[PDB]
Design a protein around this ligand. Sequence first.
Ligand code: NA
Length: 84
Amino acid sequence: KPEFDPILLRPVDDLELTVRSANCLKAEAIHYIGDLVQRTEVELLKTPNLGKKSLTEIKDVLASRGLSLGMRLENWPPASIADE
Ligand code: NA
């Protein structure tokens, strides 16, 4: 039986970051936990609206759930029903 990680398809809002951190991530097309864990710190800090404060918060909230940045995933993005 193949194994997957359901947490990856949770929206970034389930992490309960600060409104600012959440809004900054969405602006970078980072809408799910799977999108976020794939980005790296260097890459994130390079974005217009994110600083050290936010990155510290983000690394902290992710670690609290056994996650991190720079995570390699397999078979992303999550499955969807194809249109007709
Ligand atoms: Na997939």
